[PDB]
């Protein structure tokens, strides 16, 4: 039934997060910024090279 | 009648427990955990191998 449930959480969760997968990863949207910071570059850039 | 069944009760308990047989079986559905394990692998293998 849950008894199941119950061994693979303990399996899963014990040999997923003991050692291995360091940190793991939760929201990576945050990396996003680079999207903005490279917009900049673009509105930057633009004006350098498009001068006369 | 019954003595018969008692006697093939003595002889068929004594001889099948006193020594082989150790600790026998009860309940083998446990090990359907196995199912949900593998389960588990099938969902993150697919994830793993179909990525681009």
């Known amino acids: 039934r849950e008894a199941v449930e119950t061994a693979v ?3 899963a969760e ?3 997060e ?3 997968l360091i940190s793991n990863d939760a929201i990576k949207s945050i990396e996003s910024i680079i999207a903005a ?3 900049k ?3 930057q850039v633009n ?3 498009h001068h006369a």
Chains 1, 2 share one sequence.
């Open 9 to 11: 959480r303990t399996l």
């Open 14 to 16: 014990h040999a997923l």
């Open 18 to 20: 003991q050692t291995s």
């Open 37 to 39: 910071l490279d917009a």
């Open 41 to 43: 570059l673009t509105a």
């Open 47 to 49: 004006l350098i090279m």
